[PDB]
C-alpha cells in the first residue's frame, strides 16, 4: 500500500509537478526556481479549473 | 561557475557523508 | 566514563593500527614512520607562509625551518627517553630512545621528500611538454 | 489546583527590632564586639536563606523585596521626568533636536562649579544652561509624544503614584496579606499571566498609545505644526485622525474595519517597512506599531499554553520528564523540583537571560534606531551601547554567582539521580579541560596575531603583518550573513518587507574609506546617522578575542558552578560553603577555591570583555561609519578619517580602524592616545568635571591594587600597632578594629578596580564625544 | 666598520641555550 | 609531612581531632587537665597541612600546632 | 560486599591509583539510598557492604562524614591500597573513634611546655633540630 501509492504514485505526481512549475516553463523561455515558483503561476487560472471539475482549460 | 568556495563546500558536504558512511559501514561490520 | 568517542569501532581500529601503537613494529620503525608523517606536512607552513616565501628559495628556507624544528623536537622526545626509566618494551629507555633517533631520520626525511615533490612537481607533467 | 493560600497579618507592623541592627541572623544578633560586625551586617541583610531555615518565609521576603525595589525604579523614573519637566532645556530642543544639546541637569553657582553649565545648552528657559545629557531621554519622550514640560511633569506625578502603590503592596503583601508558599510554585499560573498579561496586554496597550498619541503627534510635527500647538489628544478624535490616516481611519471606518476582518485599511497606519526613514535616521513608528501588536498576539497565545485550572494546557513536569534519551540518562526529570523550589535556580536563568537581552538591545539599538535624530547624537549613541553592554555584563556574572549558589545551598543527590543536572557534574573534568584549551587556542591564535603585528611592523616588515594592506583575514562568514540580508527586503524569502538596517549594505565595497554619500544616511545635519559596516581584517581578529574573552569568562564562571561542591584538591568543599576565603595554606595552597571566588575572579574577564567590546564600538564607529557628508563630491568625511599606509611606499589608503587597529601600539596611540586629548584638556571648560573624574577613576582603581595584591594579616599587626596607640591615650573603643575579612578585602579590592576602571572610560567617552 | 659574526651570534643565542636546557633537564630529573 | 604538635595548654575539648578532614588526631588519657585527656597527632603522614585543627583550638594562643614541612604525594593532597 | 550503583565519571581514579596507592571505604548500609559522590555526582548505595575504591584517604573520610551526618551509617572503614594488592587499615586505627579518650592510646606529638617557651631560632642554628622539639 505505502509503494504503490507514495513510492510510485505521489513520487510520479511530484514529477508532473517538477515538469508543470519548472521544466515547461523553462522549454517556453520562462526561468522558473526557488526564487520566484512560490509566486508564479503554472497556469494564468491557476487551480480555479481543478477543484471545479473545468479540466478542459489546461 | 563552481567558484572555489562553492568546491570547498561541496568536500565538507562530502565529509560529512564520509563519517555518516563510517557510523554506518562500522554499524554493519 | 564510557562515550562514543571513546568507543567506537573503526576509531579504535586505526588508533591501534597507528605507528606508535601497531603490533609487532619496533620502536625505530615507529619513529620513522612518524617522523616521515609530520616532516612531510611540517614544511608547508614554513614553506608557504615563511619570511621567504615570496622569494625563490622559499622551499630551500622552508626546508631547513622543518629541520631545525625537528632537531629541537628530537631533543626533547631523546631526553626525555634518557630519563624515563618506566615501563617495558615500547617504554623501555632504549624503546624510546630508539623511537626519538627513527623521529629525527623519519623527520628530516620527510620534510626533503615533501621540498622535492614541492620543487619538483612540474615533472609529473613534464612528459606533455 | 491553583488556588490562592494566603496567611493574614503575619509580620506585626512595628519599630522594636529597629533599635537592634543584626537580629535576622543568630551571629549578629548578639551584637558587635568587633568590626567585623558591622561588615557581616550589611553583607547577610539580604541573604535571607541565612536568616531563617522556612522556605515559605524566605519566599514571603523576597516577594515584598520585590515590591521596595519597583517603588525605587518607580522613583528614579519620576525623577528623571522630573528633571526634565523643570530643570531642562526640553522646550527649546523640541523646536531644534539637531542643533542644541539636551541638558536636564544644571548647577548651583558656589565654589566655580557653574563652568559645569554650558553654552550649546543654554536656550530660552533654560538661561544658565546645563550638563549636556548622554542618556538619549529627550529623544525617548519625543518618539512616544512628548511635546511641552507640562505633560512631563504629570508623568513624573504619575510615576510617584505608581512607586506609593507599588510600596504599599510591599508592606501589605508581608505584613498583612502574605502568601502560602504553595502559591509562589504556581509556575504554570505565574507564566500565563506573565506572557498574556504582562507581556501581552502590556505591549498591547502600548500600540494604543503608539496609534492614539504616538503617530498623530508625529503626524502634527511632520506637518509643521510647532510642538506647543500640538494636541495630544489628536488621536482620540476620529475626525482628526481621519486627516492623517486617510485609509485607517476612514469612511470606510476604523473600529467597522477590524470587526469585518476588513485589517488591510489599516496600512496606513501598520506597516512592513522596515528600514528607517531618511529624515530621522530611525526606524517608522507605524513598524513600530505593527510590531508591539503582533507581538502582543503571540504574546497572548504564549500565555494560554500552560494549564491551570481548566485542564487544557501543557504540565510543565510531565514535558520535562518526557524529553530524555539514551545519551543522556533521566534526561529533564527532577528539573521542574529543581526550579520550583530553588531561588537561586530561577533567578541564574533569570539573570542570564537578562544580561543577554541587554547585550542584545546593545546592538540592535545602534543598528535599528527607534528614536528620531539620536543616530547623529553620538555621545548618546556612544552611551546607550556602553551602558547596557555594562548592564549585561554584570547580570551575567551574577548568573554565574547563583548557579554556584544552587549547587552548595539548594543541590540535592536524590532529585538528580542521573539526569541532565547529574551528568554534568559526572563530566566536569572533561568541559573544563576542553574550554582550557579552547581559551588557549582562541588566546594564541587572537592576541598572538595583533602581537605578530606589533613585532612585524616594528622590524620594518609591514607586507608580514596580518592586515587588509597585507596577508588578510577576511570574516567570510560574517559578510556572507550581510550579503544575505541586505538582499532578502523585497527577495525572495522577504518580499514585501521594504528595507532593513543600512548595516548590512556591504556587498558592494571592499572597505569603509571607499564610501558614498549616496550609501550612507546623512540627515539635516549633514551628520551620518548609520551606514554599511564593513567587516575585514581587523573585524575578524577582533571577533576572536571577543570569542577569547567570553570564552574565559565563561571558563571561570563554569569552573565556579561545577567545582563548587567538591573537587580532587577539597572533597567536601560544599560543607565549607559558597564563600570561605580558602582551606588553609595545605594541599600546597588553597586559596581562592570557593565559587565565590570564581565570582571575583569572573568580575574582572567580564571587565576585560565588556572594555574591548567598547573600545571596538568606539573606534569603528568614528573610523567606519559615524561623521559628515559634503553636498559636494558626495563625499564621506567620517570622524577620523583615512590613513595611508606606505609599504612600498606606495601609499595605501585605508580606514583609520583597518590600517591602524590591528596592533597594540596602534591601539596605544590613535586610540589611547589621541583620542584622549579632548579629556585631559578639559580644565577650564564645561567637560572639565569628566577631566576630573578620569583622573578620580585612575586613582579608585590604583586604590583598589592596595587591597587585591595585599593579606589581611599584615593590616591585622599595622591595626596591633595602632589600638596601642588607641588603648595609651584612653581613645580605645569597645568594638575592637579588625582588618577586613579575606573575602571582604577581595571585594573591595573588586569592587574599586570595577568602579575605577569603568568610571575611566567613561570620561573618557564622554569627553571625547561631547568635545566632538 | 660593521664588525659582527653572525654563526657566533646563532650559537650562543640558539644552540647552547637549547643544549643549556637539554643539559640542565638531565641535572634535574636524573634519579 | 608536616608536624603537628600538641602543647601542654590542651583543655581536652577534642574539637580539633573533631576538626580535622584526616583522622590524624585523636584523643588519649592524660591527666594535666579536667578533662584527663589530650589530642595527638599519631598519624601526620595522612596530615595535609589544611589547619582545620588549628582553627577549631579555643585556647589563647594555641595548644596544637601545624608546622609545613617537607611535601609529599599525601601532604599536597594530590589524587595523581 | 560490592560497588554503589554509579554510572562513572571523569572525577575517579588515575594512573596513581594503579602504581602508587588507592583507597577503599567499607560500610554496611540498611536501605538502598542515594548518596553524592565525592568524585561528583550520585550514586546509590545497596542495602548490604559497600566498597568503593577513591583516589585520596581524604576523599574517603569525606564520604564517611557523608555517611555519618546524613544517613547515620557509623562503621564505615578505610583501607590503603597497595598497588601489589595489599590492603592495610587504616581508619579506624583502634576500633575506638578519634574523639573519645582510650587507655591504650600513646601520646603522639606531646610538647611538654606552653607554645611561647619554644627556643629561639639562634639557639637551634646549624641543625636539623626545629625549635619545636
Ligand atoms: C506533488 C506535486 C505537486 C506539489 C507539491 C505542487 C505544489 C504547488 N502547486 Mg502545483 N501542480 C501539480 C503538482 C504539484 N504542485 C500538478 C500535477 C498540476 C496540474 C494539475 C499542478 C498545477 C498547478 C496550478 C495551475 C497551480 C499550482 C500551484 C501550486 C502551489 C500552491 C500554491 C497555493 O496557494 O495553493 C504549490 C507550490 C498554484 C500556484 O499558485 O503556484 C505558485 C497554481 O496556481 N499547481
Ligand atoms: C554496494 C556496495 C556494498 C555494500 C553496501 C556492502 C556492505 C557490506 N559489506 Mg561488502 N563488499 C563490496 C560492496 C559492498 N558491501 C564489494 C564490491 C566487495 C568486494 C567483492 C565487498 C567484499 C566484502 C568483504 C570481504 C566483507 C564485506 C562486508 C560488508 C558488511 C560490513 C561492512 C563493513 O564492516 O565495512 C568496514 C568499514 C569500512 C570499510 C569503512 C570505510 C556490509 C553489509 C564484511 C562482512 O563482514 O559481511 C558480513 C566483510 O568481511 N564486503
Ligand atoms: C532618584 C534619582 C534622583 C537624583 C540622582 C536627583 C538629583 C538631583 N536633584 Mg532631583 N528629584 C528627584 C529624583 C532625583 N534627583 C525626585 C524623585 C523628585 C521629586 C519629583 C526630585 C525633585 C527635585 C527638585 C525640586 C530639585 C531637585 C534637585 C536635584 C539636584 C540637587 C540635589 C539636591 O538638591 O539635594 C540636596 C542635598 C541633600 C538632600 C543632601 C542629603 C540633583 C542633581 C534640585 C535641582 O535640580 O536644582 C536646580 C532641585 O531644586 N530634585
Ligand atoms: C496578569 C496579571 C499579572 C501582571 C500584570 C503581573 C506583573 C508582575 N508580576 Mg506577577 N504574578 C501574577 C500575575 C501578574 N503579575 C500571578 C497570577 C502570580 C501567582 C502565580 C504572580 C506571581 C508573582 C511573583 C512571585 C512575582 C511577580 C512579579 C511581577 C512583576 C515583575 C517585575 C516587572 O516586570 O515590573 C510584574 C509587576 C515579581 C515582583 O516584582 O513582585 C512585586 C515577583 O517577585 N508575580
Ligand atoms: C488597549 C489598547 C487600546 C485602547 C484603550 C484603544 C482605544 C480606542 N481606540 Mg484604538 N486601537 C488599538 C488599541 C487601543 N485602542 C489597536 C491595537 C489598534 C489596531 C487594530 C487600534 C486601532 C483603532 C482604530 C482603527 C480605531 C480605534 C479607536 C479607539 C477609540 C474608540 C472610540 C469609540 O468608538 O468609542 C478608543 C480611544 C477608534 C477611534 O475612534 O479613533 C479615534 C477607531 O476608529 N483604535
Ligand atoms: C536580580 C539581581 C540579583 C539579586 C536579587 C541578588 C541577590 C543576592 N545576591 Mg547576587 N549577584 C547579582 C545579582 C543579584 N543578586 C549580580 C549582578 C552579581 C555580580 C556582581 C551577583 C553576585 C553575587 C555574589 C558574589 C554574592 C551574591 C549574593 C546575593 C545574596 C545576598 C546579597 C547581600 O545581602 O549582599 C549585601 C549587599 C551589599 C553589602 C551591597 C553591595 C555593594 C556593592 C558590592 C558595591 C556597590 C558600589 C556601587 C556600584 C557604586 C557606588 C560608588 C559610590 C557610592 C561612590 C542575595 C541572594 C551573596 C550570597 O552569598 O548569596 C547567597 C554573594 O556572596 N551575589
Ligand atoms: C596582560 C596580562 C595577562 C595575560 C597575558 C594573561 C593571560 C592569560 N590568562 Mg590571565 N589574568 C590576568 C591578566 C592576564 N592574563 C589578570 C590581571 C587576572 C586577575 C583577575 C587574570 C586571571 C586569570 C584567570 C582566572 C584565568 C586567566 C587565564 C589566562 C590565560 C587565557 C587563555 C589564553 O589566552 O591563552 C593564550 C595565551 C596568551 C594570550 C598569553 C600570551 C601568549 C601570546 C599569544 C604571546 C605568545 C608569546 C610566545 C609564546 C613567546 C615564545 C592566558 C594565559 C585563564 C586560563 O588559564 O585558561 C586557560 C583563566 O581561567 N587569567
Ligand atoms: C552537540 C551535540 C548534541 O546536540 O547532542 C544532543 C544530545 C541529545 O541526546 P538525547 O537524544 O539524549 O537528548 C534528549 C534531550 O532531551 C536531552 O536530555 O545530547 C548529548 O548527546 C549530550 C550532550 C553531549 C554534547 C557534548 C558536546
Ligand atoms: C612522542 C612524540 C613526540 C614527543 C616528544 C616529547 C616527549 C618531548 C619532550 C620534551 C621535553 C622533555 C622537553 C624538555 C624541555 C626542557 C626545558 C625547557 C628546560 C628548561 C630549563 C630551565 C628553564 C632551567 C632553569 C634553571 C634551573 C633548573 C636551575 C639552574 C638555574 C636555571 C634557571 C638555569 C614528538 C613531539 C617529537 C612528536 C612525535 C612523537
Ligand atoms: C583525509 C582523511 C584522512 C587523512 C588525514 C591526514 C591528516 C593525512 C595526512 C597524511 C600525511 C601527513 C602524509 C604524509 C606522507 C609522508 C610521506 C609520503 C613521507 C615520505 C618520506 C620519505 C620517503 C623519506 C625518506 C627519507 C629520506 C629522504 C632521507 C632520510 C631517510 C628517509 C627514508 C626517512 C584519514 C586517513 C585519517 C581518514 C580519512 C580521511
Ligand atoms: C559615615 C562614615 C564613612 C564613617 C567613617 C567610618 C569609620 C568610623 C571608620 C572607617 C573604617 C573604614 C571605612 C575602612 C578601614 C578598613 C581597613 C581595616 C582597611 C585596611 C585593609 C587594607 C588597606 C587592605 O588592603 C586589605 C587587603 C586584604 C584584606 C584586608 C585588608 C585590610 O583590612
Ligand atoms: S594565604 Fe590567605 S587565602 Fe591563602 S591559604 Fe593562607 S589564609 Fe587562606
Ligand atoms: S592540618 Fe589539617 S590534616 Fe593536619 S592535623 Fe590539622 S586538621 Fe588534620
Not at chain 1, 509537478?17 to 523561455?29: C, F, L, Q, W
Not at chain 4, 544644571?106 to 550649546?120: A, C, K, Y
Not at chain 4, 474595519?257 to 530611525?282: H, I, S
Not at chain 4, 547585550?359 to 528620531?372: D, L, Q, S, T, W
Amino acid at each position: 500500500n505505502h509503494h504503490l501509492s507514495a513510492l510510485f504514485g505521489v513520487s510520479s505526481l511530484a514529477f508532473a509537478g517538477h515538469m508543470i512549475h519548472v521544466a515547461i516553463p523553462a522549454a517556453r523561455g520562462q526561468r522558473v526556481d526557488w526564487s520566484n515558483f512560490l509566486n508564479t503561476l503554472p497556469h494564468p487560472a491557476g487551480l480555479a479549473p481543478f477543484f471545479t471539475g473545468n479540466w478542459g482549460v489546461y | 561557475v563552481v567558484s572555489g568556495a562553492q568546491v570547498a563546500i561541496a568536500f565538507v558536504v562530502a565529509l560529512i557523508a564520509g563519517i555518516a558512511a563510517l557510523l554506518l559501514s562500522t554499524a554493519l561490520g | 566514563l564510557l562515550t562514543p568517542v571513546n568507543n567506537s569501532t573503526a576509531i579504535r581500529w586505526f588508533i591501534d593500527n597507528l605507528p606508535i601503537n601497531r603490533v609487532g613494529m619496533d620502536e625505530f620503525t615507529r619513529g620513522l614512520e612518524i617522523g616521515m608523517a609530520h616532516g612531510y606536512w611540517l614544511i608547508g607552513p614554513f614553506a608557504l607562509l615563511g619570511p621567504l616565501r615570496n622569494t625563490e628559495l622559499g622551499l630551500v628556507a622552508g626546508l631547513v625551518s622543518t629541520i631545525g624544528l625537528l632537531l629541537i623536537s628530537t631533543i626533547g622526545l631523546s631526553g626525555y627517553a634518557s630519563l624515563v626509566e618506566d615501563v617495558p618494551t615500547e617504554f623501555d629507555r632504549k624503546g624510546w630512545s630508539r623511537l626519538a633517533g627513527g623521529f629525527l631520520v623519519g623527520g628530516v626525511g620527510g620534510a626533503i621528500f615533501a621540498f622535492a615533490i614541492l620543487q619538483f612537481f612540474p615533472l609529473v607533467s613534464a612528459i606533455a611538454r | 489546583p491553583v488556588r490562592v493560600l494566603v496567611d493574614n497579618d503575619p509580620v506585626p507592623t512595628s519599630t522594636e527590632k529597629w533599635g537592634k541592627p543584626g537580629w535576622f541572623e543568630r551571629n549578629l544578633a548578639r551584637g558587635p564586639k568587633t568590626t567585623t560586625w558591622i561588615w557581616d551586617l550589611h553583607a547577610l541583610a539580604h541573604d535571607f536563606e541565612t536568616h531563617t531555615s522556612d522556605k515559605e518565609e524566605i519566599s514571603r521576603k523576597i516577594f515584598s523585596a520585590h515590591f521596595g525595589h519597583l517603588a525605587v525604579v518607580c522613583v528614579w523614573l519620576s525623577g528623571m521626568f522630573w528633571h526634565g519637566a523643570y530643570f531642562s532645556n526640553f522646550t527649546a530642543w523640541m523646536e531644534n533636536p539637531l542643533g542644541l544639546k539636551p541638558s536636564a541637569q544644571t548647577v548651583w553657582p558656589v565654589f566655580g562649579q557653574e563652568i559645569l553649565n554650558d553654552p550649546s545648552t543654554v536656550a530660552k528657559g533654560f538661561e544658565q544652561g546645563g550638563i549636556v545629557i548622554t542618556s538619549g531621554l529627550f529623544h525617548l519622550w519625543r518618539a512616544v509624544g512628548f511635546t511641552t514640560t507640562g505633560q512631563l511633569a504629570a508623568m513624573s506625578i504619575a510615576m510617584l503614584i505608581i512607586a506609593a502603590l507599588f510600596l504599599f503592596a510591599g508592606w501589605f503583601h508581608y505584613h498583612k496579606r502574605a502568601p502560602k508558599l504553595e502559591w509562589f510554585q504556581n509556575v504554570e499560573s505565574m507564566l500565563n499571566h506573565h506572557l498574556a498579561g504582562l507581556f501581552g496586554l502590556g505591549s498591547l496597550f502600548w500600540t494604543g498609545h503608539l496609534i492614539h498619541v504616538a503617530l498623530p503627534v508625529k503626524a502634527q510635527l511632520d506637518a509643521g505644526i510647532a510642538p506647543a500647538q500640538v494636541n495630544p489628544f489628536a488621536g482620540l478624535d476620529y475626525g482628526l485622525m481621519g486627516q492623517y490616516f486617510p485609509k485607517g481611519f476612514g469612511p470606510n471606518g476604523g473600529l467597522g474595519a477590524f470587526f469585518t476582518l476588513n485589517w488591510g485599511q489599516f496600512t496606513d497606519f501598520l506597516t512592513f517597512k522596515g528600514g528607517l526613514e531618511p529624515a530621522t535616521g530611525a526606524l517608522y513608528l507605524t513598524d513600530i506599531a505593527h510590531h508591539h501588536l503582533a507581538i502582543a498576539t503571540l504574546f497572548i497565545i504564549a500565555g494560554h499554553m500552560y494549564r491551570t485550572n481548566w485542564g487544557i494546557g501543557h504540565s510543565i513536569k510531565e514535558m520535562l520528564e518526557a524529553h530524555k534519551g539514551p545519551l543522556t540518562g533521566e534526561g529533564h526529570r527532577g528539573l521542574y523540583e529543581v526550579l520550583t523550589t530553588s531561588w537561586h535556580a530561577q533567578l541564574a536563568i533569570n539573570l542570564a537571560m537578562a544580561g543577554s537581552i541587554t547585550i542584545i538591545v546593545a546592538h540592535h539599538m545602534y543598528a535599528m534606531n527607534p528614536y528620531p535624530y539620536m543616530g547623529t547624537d553620538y555621545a548618546t549613541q556612544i552611551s546607550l551601547f556602553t551602558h547596557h553592554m555594562w548592564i549585561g555584563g554584570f547580570l551575567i556574572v551574577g548568573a554565574g554567582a547563583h548557579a554556584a549558589i544552587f549547587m552548595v545551598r539548594d543541590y540535592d543527590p536524590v532529585t538528580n539521580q542521573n539526569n541532565l543536572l547529574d551528568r554534568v557534574l559526572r563530566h566536569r573534568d572533561a568541559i573544563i579541560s576542553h574550554l582550557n584549551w579552547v581559551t588557549l587556542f582562541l588566546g594564541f591564535h587572537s592576541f598572538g596575531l595583533y602581537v605578530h603585528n606589533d613585532t612585524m611592523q616594528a622590524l620594518g616588515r609591514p607586507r608580514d603583518m596580518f592586515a587588509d594592506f597585507a596577508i588578510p583575514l577576511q570574516p567570510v562568514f560574517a559578510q556572507w550573513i550581510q550579503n544575505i540580508h541586505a538582499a532578502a527586503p523585497g527577495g525572495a524569502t522577504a518580499p514585501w518587507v521594504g528595507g532593513t538596517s543600512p548595516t548590512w549594505y556591504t556587498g558592494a565595497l571592499s572597505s569603509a574609506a571607499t564610501l558614498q554619500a549616496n550609501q550612507v544616511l546623512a540627515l539635516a545635519n549633514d551628520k551620518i546617522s548609520i551606514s554599511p559596516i564593513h567587516l575585514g581584517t581587523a573585524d575578524f581578529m577582533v571577533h576572536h578575542i571577543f570569542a577569547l574573552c567570553i570564552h574565559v569568562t565563561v571558563l571561570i564562571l563554569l569552573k565556579g558552578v561545577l567545582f563548587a561542591r567538591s573537587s580532587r584538591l577539597i572533597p567536601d568543599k560544599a560543607n565549607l560553603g559558597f564563600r570561605f576565603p580558602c582551606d588553609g595554606p595545605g594541599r600546597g595552597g588553597t586559596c581562592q577555591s570557593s565559587a565565590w571566588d570564581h565570582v571575583f575572579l569572573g568580575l574582572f574577564w567580564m571587565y576585560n570583555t565588556i572594555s574591548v567590546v567598547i573600545f571596538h564600538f568606539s573606534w569603528k564607529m568614528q573610523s567606519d561609519v559615524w561623521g559628515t557628508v559634503d553636498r559636494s563630491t558626495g563625499a564621506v568625511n567620517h570622524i577620523i578619517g583615512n590613513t595611508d599606509v606606505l609599504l612600498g611606499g606606495q601609499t595605501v589608503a585605508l580606514s583609520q580602524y583597518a590600517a591602524s587597529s590591528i596592533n597594540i601600539n596602534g591601539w596605544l596611540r590613535d586610540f589611547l592616545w589621541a583620542q584622549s586629548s579632548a579629556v585631559i584638556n578639559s580644565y577650564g571648560g564645561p567637560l572639565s568635571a569628566y577631566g576630573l573624574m578620569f583622573l578620580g577613576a585612575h586613582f579608585i582603581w590604583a586604590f583598589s591594587l592596595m587591597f587585591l595584591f595585599s593579606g589581611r594579616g599584615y593590616w591585622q599587626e599595622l591595626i596591633e600597632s595602632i589600638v596601642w596607640a588607641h588603648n595609651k591615650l584612653k581613645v580605645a573603643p569597645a568594638i575592637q578594629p579588625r582588618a577586613l575579612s579575606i573575602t571582604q578585602g577581595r571585594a573591595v579590592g573588586v569592587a574599586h578596580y570595577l568602579l575605577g576602571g569603568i568610571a575611566t572610560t567613561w570620561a573618557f567617552f564622554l569627553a571625547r564625544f561631547l568635545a566632538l | 666598520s660593521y664588525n659582527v659574526f653572525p654563526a657566533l651570534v646563532i650559537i650562543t643565542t640558539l644552540v647552547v641555550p637549547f643544549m643549556a636546557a637539554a643539559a640542565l633537564l638531565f641535572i634535574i630529573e636524573r634519579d | 609531612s608536616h608536624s603537628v604538635k600538641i602543647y601542654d595548654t590542651c583543655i581536652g575539648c577534642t574539637q580539633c581531632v573533631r576538626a580535622c578532614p584526616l583522622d590524624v588526631l585523636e584523643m588519649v588519657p592524660w591527666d594535666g587537665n579536667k578533662a584527663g585527656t589530650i589530642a595527638s597527632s599519631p598519624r601526620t603522614e595522612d596530615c595535609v597541612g589544611c589547619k582545620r585543627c588549628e582553627t577549631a583550638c579555643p585556647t589563647d594562643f594555641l595548644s596544637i600546632r601545624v608546622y609545613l614541612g617537607a611535601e609529599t604525594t599525601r601532604s599536597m593532597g594530590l589524587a595523581y | 560486599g560490592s560497588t554503589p550503583l554509579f554510572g562513572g565519571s571523569t572525577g575517579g581514579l588515575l594512573r596513581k591509583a594503579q602504581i602508587e596507592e588507592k583507597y577503599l571505604i567499607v560500610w554496611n548500609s540498611k536501605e538502598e539510598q542515594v548518596f553524592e559522590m565525592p568524585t561528583g555526582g550520585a550514586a546509590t548505595m545497596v542495602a548490604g557492604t559497600n566498597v568503593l575504591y577513591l583516589a585520596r584517604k581524604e576523599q574517603c573520610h569525606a564520604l564517611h562524614r557523608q555517611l555519618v551526618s546524613t544517613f547515620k551509617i557509623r562503621d564505615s572503614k578505610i583501607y590503603r591500597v597497595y598497588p601489589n594488592g595489599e590492603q592495610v587499615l587504616i581508619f579506624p586505627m583502634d576500633g575506638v573513634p578519634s574523639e573519645k579518650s582510650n587507655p591504650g592510646r600513646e601520646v603522639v606529638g606531646y610538647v611538654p611546655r606552653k607554645i611561647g617557651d619554644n627556643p629561639n631560632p639562634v639557639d637551634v642554628k646549624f641543625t636539623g633540630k626545629e625549635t619545636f622539639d
